[PDB]
Design a binder for this molecule. Structure first.
Ligand SMILES: Nc1nc2c(ncn2[C@@H]2O[C@H](COP(=O)(O)OP(=O)(O)NP(=O)(O)O)[C@@H](O)[C@H]2O)c(=O)[nH]1
Ligand SMILES: Nc1ncnc2c1ncn2[C@@H]1O[C@H](COP(=O)(O)OP(=O)(O)OP(O)(O)=S)[C@@H](O)[C@H]1O
Ligand SMILES: Nc1ncnc2c1ncn2[C@@H]1O[C@H](COP(=O)(O)OP(=O)(O)OP(O)(O)=S)[C@@H](O)[C@H]1O
Ligand SMILES: O=C(NOCCO)c1ccc2cncn2c1Nc1ccc(I)cc1F
Ligand SMILES: [Mg+2]
Ligand SMILES: [Mg+2]
Ligand SMILES: [Zn+2]
Ligand SMILES: [Zn+2]
Lengths: 311, 229, 431, 167, 229
């Protein structure tokens, strides 16, 4: 709209003020989070005064592959959407790949979910809207697919924005990522565990698998116990075997409306083609309803984190 | 009497003692008795293993000789030990070649056996060509060229291209071209021709001839794959 | 329709099967198991697509054929290879490939190198895939560093259970800030007991374990290695070496692992990252054991949450369904993946752009290291060892006493066997 | 001389394929590779008759029931398999019998009830339940373990005998 | 010079030839100088392989002799070949014993070397025991018994329960008990005692001998499992 265009243009304006990205141009302010393969810091770019997030991935790869990754990561300069985290520049130094993005002071939805215990359906509606619009922008404007949709990659700020990040834009970077340490849980759609990406359908499952996890405050595989649900250590290979050979998870009986439950069930179909696409979800009853609702996302976020109300 | 010596040769083969089998077969062929298939195959295996063990020993000795040249006169005795090994290598091949000159070649009433004996002569000449250097190498290889060229014709004219003896002859000739004359393109072309001819004429073999020919063809495929790269 | 892009396959003797049409999988591998159940092998068969019967290559990517019907037939062509068994007495250390026991006298396949006792002939593999005398004597051939001593220097890099720094402690050492920063009084005791064992290991191929330090959290102190790791020399610079040095590296790694297993220490982490070339000559294995500092505890239990590059984890380790998956045979599988990495110069599964996919398919017994990327001169005996190390069932994998011996057996026969083959002896066998 | 078309049906995971592979090759498969379709031939002497068995091993996953139904239509007799640790698979024997009646357009189809996985601890479908269900349909009940091979031949041979009775 | 002879012996050992190696080490011992630790292993390996080839030949020949089960001259000739190879083995063992009891055993400062040489003496007396059937058997059997008891006293006195030499002596002594004397109860007792005592000091395993220790341990376990059935 108008405010989104304003913010995008202001981000571009603040982006032109940044030239070459040198390692000496950053002063480390704080740590923001860490995963199994990278560490992110909030830092200040001295030459331009801006404050950004800097992800550092430490890969032991040959210099040619590293350079091709660096070159491929420059496509992120084209991604300009209110549902995609802003990108300032990527480079390599001191044996680590550094990716510079805009700072989301609200954090990722995993941290917000940990702070909140559970997330209300009404908030989840706007979250799903943003996720779907970001996936649409990635599928249409760039013909690339996220492939790593989960609460750890959905970011939010104090201005009520909800943006996607950590999507698969550099194929060589994914190829390097295939030599990673085993995680504790997977959001991979069942077809990807036996075949290859079935287009954006393979992303949508993850979103659903995320929403339920945010809907209940618990990793939904295996589904909660009979009395753990009323209270409202599986091996990773066992989780994958459950994902492939067991019925998908579902929302609780009566805690959530039927449109949200139908949305998540359509999002969690084990057959990707029978599973809904972006256009189906965009005009879903739950999506229409949550788009009609005037939910105060920024204030709810600030409240949950423990900061004073914004605006 | 003959059967007693053949039984002794078989018993020596089972006992892994090979020099006794070599002697017991040389004394059998010394008489000039009609040599059948198994009787000559025992001789072939005996004279193959006896020379093969010493050839492997010579290869190891030569490899150790060239491990480190920047050293004292420890290589001095190494080459003299190798010379002794050759002194115990060439003369047995000469005992085989003289034997082939005595009885085998004249007392042959079947072209297949003639091809077999000529291939053996060529194989032992190729065995001698490795250690022999200078003009002796040339003098040795000039005999093996004709030994194989007087056998390939008979193989092509009297026996099928799928015959295990013809396949063995082609394999040995390709190895001779590759290792001695160092013409890898001609060796590859010869091997490809033999293998394509074998494939073009297949599924006609006997029931017994379903292991050995396959073995030679699989070794041919291994060599072709090794020489392509 | 595609129904999980499947392919319908018609088989000999009116049989049939459905296989998943997954990108990146050959027809051969999609069908391997179905054929095996019927005593068939792709190499003894032909495959066709219906279009009406048109021949396709066994190495075709099956995902191109989703929705199609394939047919597999035989033509009774080359019978792979028949075992050329020669009776041989072994004057050197040899083991029967079936029974893993000492083999003083027995049979050897000239082509494929298989070795077995006279008494085990009923257990020999059928296809040559390229009252007895009791045996006798064979041939003969407080550790806590206090504060104020470890000069922690420059950060080197983070791992799967800790970050490594180059420290100064009576010379250059490698300090390791273990990720487990707050250990319980039981985990600390178990770690001290593990260090008790690790301090009593002294081998030329094993990195020296110089204790730890408790005051500044937990910090394993190992011998600092100069030069670079094997992973660095195999995937960063891609500086391939002659086969002799490669087999020597494999032999020294196997010797170090044999020393580790002689003292009943499961490495749990053997991989090209933890194999160093000390002065470009000596192989040194590091980061072994330390089972108690991995999989952070919640009490007196140490449920292994599993952590490490899955490329080297055995299928039994990937499953984690077993009570304890880090046994000697999982170490052997890790070594086998190291052998594959050394031999081909590429990491296993160089055609997959997902990590969870690899974990699922490997732990499921569907994905295996492809053995069609090897060099065109590796002796078949050597390659057979690598294929034995990567057996899905862990009970089939050999132990390191056998692997070291098998490596050394072909280490000496390397130069002689590199020349072209020759006319072999005929059958000369019978059972 | 005599060919018999045997169809193995029942819920996912009960051991249809492991039972079939034990019959065909005397080997237990410990992996769980779900079936879409698999057919086998095995020659065997049963009661003095050399028998050619066509074994049609079907999918337990209902997603592939269309393929299952094509196999069922050709079959002459049915092994209806449940697992002794899966009560739903036992209850759903009724579903499979109804499917057979539907596809065969007949209530008079040779059938044998098989309770598999009897080597497991903590069995939850008891012998009385299983025998009462078999009795309710007038069919034999055979306990099996594809792991130990107990009952495997008896299950398939009994079905062949039931087909002979029906012929 | 001794180093030239030792290098020649090692070179012949690397060449898989065990006739020049045995002669070279016999010439080394004939000098009458005390061997080092390294030089002794080469002698042991050479005079083990030389005898081992004849042992394999003898085993397979006796198997064929027990397989034929007929009435002809094949059995008589097989007996003649067996007595020939037996005479050859007797000559080898007698040469070894003559070279052992005159230059090494009487001059052995190190008790470890004394245990090694007494183990070798018992081994070769057992090698002679298994072939010679008759009245002479009781002499060599008792000689081997005396040698092994003498070695075992020193092993119990001044040896480690995890040393390769003590484990090898125990293994050879248990095999001697089981095969020659046919008293498996005491053989099992000895094997279990030795295996337990080797289990005692499992931590004390330096790099010098870990492979040999665990290999003899596994061989003892295999023999124990074979004999307890
Ligand atoms: N312990 C045990 N496991 C068994 C037995 N029979 C099958 N299994 C196991 O159960 C799993 C499923 O077996 P399978 O034969 O594939 O079952 P299915 O009924 O054919 N499944 P689907 O309907 O999907 O084709 C496999 O892991 C198999 O090893 C048995 O008798 N005992
Ligand atoms: N742009 C960002 N701004 C602020 N924090 C961020 C940003 N990107 C990532 N983070 C933090 O880093 C973590 C998520 O990033 P990653 O660690 O890369 O993802 P992950 O948790 O490792 O899961 P993955 O990517 O599926 S392996 C969280 O703790 C976030 O708070
Ligand atoms: N003993 C050592 N001496 C010298 N450098 C070392 C040593 N151990 C590790 N390193 C270095 O540390 C770097 C990364 O740290 P590590 O944690 O050892 O990596 P890692 O081996 O992948 O981790 P794990 O726990 O073994 S999977 C490697 O690239 C090595 O260069
Ligand atoms: O970040 C990644 N994986 O997580 C690290 C493991 O801890 C990641 C994974 C795949 C990928 C392909 N192309 C870039 N890729 C990534 N990087 C990345 C992408 C977009 C944004 I906006 C920010 C990023 F950091
Ligand atoms: Mg992330
Ligand atoms: Mg099945
Ligand atoms: Zn073989
Ligand atoms: Zn054996």
């Amino acid at each position: 709209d108008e405010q989104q265009r304003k913010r995008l243009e202001a981000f571009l304006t603040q982006k032109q003020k940044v030239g070459e990205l040198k390692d000496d141009d950053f002063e480390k302010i704080s740590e923001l989070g860490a995963g199994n393969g990278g560490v992110v810091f909030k830092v200040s770019h001295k030459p331009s005064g801006l404050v950004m997030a800097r992800k550092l991935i430490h890969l032991e790869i040959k210099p040619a592959i590293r350079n091709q990754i660096i070159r491929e990561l420059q496509v992120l300069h084209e991604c300009n959407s209110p549902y995609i985290v802003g990108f300032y520049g990527a480079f390599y130094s001191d044996g680590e790949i550094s990716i510079c993005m805009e700072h989301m002071d609200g954090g990722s939805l995993d941290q917000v979910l940990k702070k909140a215990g559970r997330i209300p359906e009404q908030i989840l509606g706007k979250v799903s809207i943003a996720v779907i619009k970001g996936l649409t922008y990635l599928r249409e404007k760039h013909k690339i697919m996220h492939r790593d949709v989960k609460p750890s990659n959905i970011l939010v700020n104090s201005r009520g924005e909800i943006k996607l990040c950590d999507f698969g834009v550099s194929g060589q970077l994914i190829d390097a990522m295939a030599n990673a340490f085993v995680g504790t849980r997977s959001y991979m759609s069942p077809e990807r565990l036996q075949g290859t990406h079935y287009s954006v359908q393979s992303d949508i499952w993850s979103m659903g698998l995320s929403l339920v996890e945010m809907a209940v405050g618990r990793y939904p595989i295996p589904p909660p116990d009979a009395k753990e649900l009323e209270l409202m250590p599986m091996a990773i290979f066992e989780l994958l075997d459950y994902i492939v050979n067991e019925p998908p998870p579902k929302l609780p009986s009566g805690v959530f409306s039927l449109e949200f439950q139908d949305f998540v069930n359509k999002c969690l179909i084990k057959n990707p083609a029978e599973r809904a696409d972006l256009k189906q979800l965009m005009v879903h009853a739950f999506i229409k309803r949550s788009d009609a609702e005037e939910v105060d996302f920024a204030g709810w976020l600030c409240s949950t984190i423990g900061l004073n109300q914004p605006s | 009497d003959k059967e007693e010596l053949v039984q002794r040769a078989k018993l020596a083969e089972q006992a892994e003692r090979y020099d006794d089998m070599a002697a017991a077969m040389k004394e059998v062929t010394e008489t000039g008795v009609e040599l059948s298939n198994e009787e000559r195959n025992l001789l072939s295996v005996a004279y193959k293993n006896v020379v093969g063990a010493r050839r492997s020993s010579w290869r190891v000795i030569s490899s150790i000789e060239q491990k480190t040249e920047g050293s004292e006169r420890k290589q001095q005795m190494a080459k003299e030990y190798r010379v002794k090994v050759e002194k115990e290598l060439r003369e047995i091949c000469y005992d085989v070649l003289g034997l082939l000159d005595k009885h085998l070649i004249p007392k042959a009433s079947n072209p297949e056996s003639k091809v077999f004996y000529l291939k053996m002569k060529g194989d032992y000449y190729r065995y001698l060509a490795e250690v022999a250097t200078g003009e002796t190498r040339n003098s040795v290889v000039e005999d093996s060229q004709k030994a194989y060229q007087d056998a390939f014709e008979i193989s092509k004219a009297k026996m099928q291209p799928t015959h295990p003896i013809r396949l063995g002859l082609a394999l040995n000739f390709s190895v001779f071209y590759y290792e001695i004359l160092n013409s890898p393109d001609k060796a590859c072309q010869l091997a490809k021709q033999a293998f394509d001819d074998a494939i073009a004429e297949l599924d006609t073999l006997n029931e017994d001839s379903y292991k050995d020919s396959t073995l030679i063809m699989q070794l041919l495929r291994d060599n072709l794959t090794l020489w392509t790269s | 329709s595609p129904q999980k892009p499947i392919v319908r396959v018609f088989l000999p003797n009116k049989q049939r099967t459905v296989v998943p049409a997954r990108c990146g999988v050959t027809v051969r591998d999609s069908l391997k198991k179905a054929l095996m159940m019927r005593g068939l092998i792709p190499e003894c068969c032909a495959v066709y697509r219906i279009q009406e019967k048109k021949p396709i290559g066994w190495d075709t990517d099956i995902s191109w054929l989703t929705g199609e019907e394939l047919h597999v037939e035989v033509l009774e062509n080359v019978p792979l290879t028949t075992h050329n068994f020669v009776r041989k007495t072994f004057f050197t250390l040899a083991f029967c490939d079936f029974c893993r026991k000492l083999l003083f006298q027995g049979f050897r396949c000239q082509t494929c190198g298989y070795k077995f006792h006279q008494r085990c002939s009923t257990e020999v593999p059928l296809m040559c895939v390229n009252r007895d005398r009791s045996s006798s004597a064979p041939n003969v051939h407080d550790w806590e560093i206090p504060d104020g001593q470890i000069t922690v220097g420059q950060r080197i890099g983070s791992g799967s259970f800790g970050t490594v720094y180059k420290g100064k402690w009576h010379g250059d050492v490698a300090v390791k800030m273990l990720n487990v920063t707050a250990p319980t009084p039981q985990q600390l005791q178990a770690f001290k007991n593990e260090v008790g064992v690790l301090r009593k290991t002294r081998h030329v191929n094993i990195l020296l374990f110089m204790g730890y330090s408790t005051k500044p959290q937990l910090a394993i102190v190992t011998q600092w290695c100069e030069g670079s790791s094997l992973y660095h020399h195999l995937h960063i610079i891609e500086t391939k070496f002659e086969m002799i040095k490669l087999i020597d590296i494999a032999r020294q790694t196997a010797q170090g692992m044999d020393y580790l297993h002689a003292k009943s220490i499961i490495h749990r982490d053997l991989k090209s990252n933890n194999i160093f070339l000390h002065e470009d000559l000596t192989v040194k294995i590091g980061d072994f054991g330390l089972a108690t500092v991995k999989s952070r505890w919640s009490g007196s239990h140490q449920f292994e949450q599993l952590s490490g590059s899955i490329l080297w984890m055995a299928p039994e380790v990937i499953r984690m369904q077993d009570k304890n998956p880090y046994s000697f045979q999982s170490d052997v599988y890790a070594f086998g993946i190291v052998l594959y990495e050394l031999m081909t110069g590429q990491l296993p599964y160089s055609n997959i752009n997902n990590r969870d996919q690899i974990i699922f398919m490997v732990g499921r017994g569907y994905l295996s290291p492809d053995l069609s990327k090897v060099r065109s001169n590796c002796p078949k005996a050597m390659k057979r060892l690598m294929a034995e190390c990567l057996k899905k069932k862990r009970d089939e994998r050999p132990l390191f006493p056998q692997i070291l011996a098998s490596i050394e057996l072909l280490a000496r026969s390397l130069p002689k066997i590199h020349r072209s083959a020759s006319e072999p002896s005929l059958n000369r066998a019978g059972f | 001389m005599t060919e018999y078309k045997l169809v193995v049906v029942g819920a996912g995971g009960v051991g249809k394929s492991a039972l079939t592979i034990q019959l065909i090759q005397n080997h237990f498969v410990d992996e769980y590779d779900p079936t879409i379709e698999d057919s086998y031939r095995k020659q065997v002497v049963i009661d003095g008759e050399t028998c050619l068995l066509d074994i049609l091993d079907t999918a337990g996953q209902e997603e592939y029931s269309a393929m299952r139904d094509q196999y069922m239509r050709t079959g002459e007799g049915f092994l209806c398999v449940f697992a002794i640790n899966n009560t739903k698979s036992f209850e759903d024997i009724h579903h499979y019998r109804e499917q057979i009646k539907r596809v065969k357009d007949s209530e008079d189809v040779p059938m044998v009830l098989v309770g598999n996985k009897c080597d497991l601890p903590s069995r939850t479908v008891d012998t009385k339940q299983a025998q009462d269900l078999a009795r309710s349909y007038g069919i034999p009940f055979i306990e099996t373990s594809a792991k130990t091979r107990q009952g495997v031949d008896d299950a398939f041979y009994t079905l062949v005998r039931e087909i002979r009775k029906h012929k």
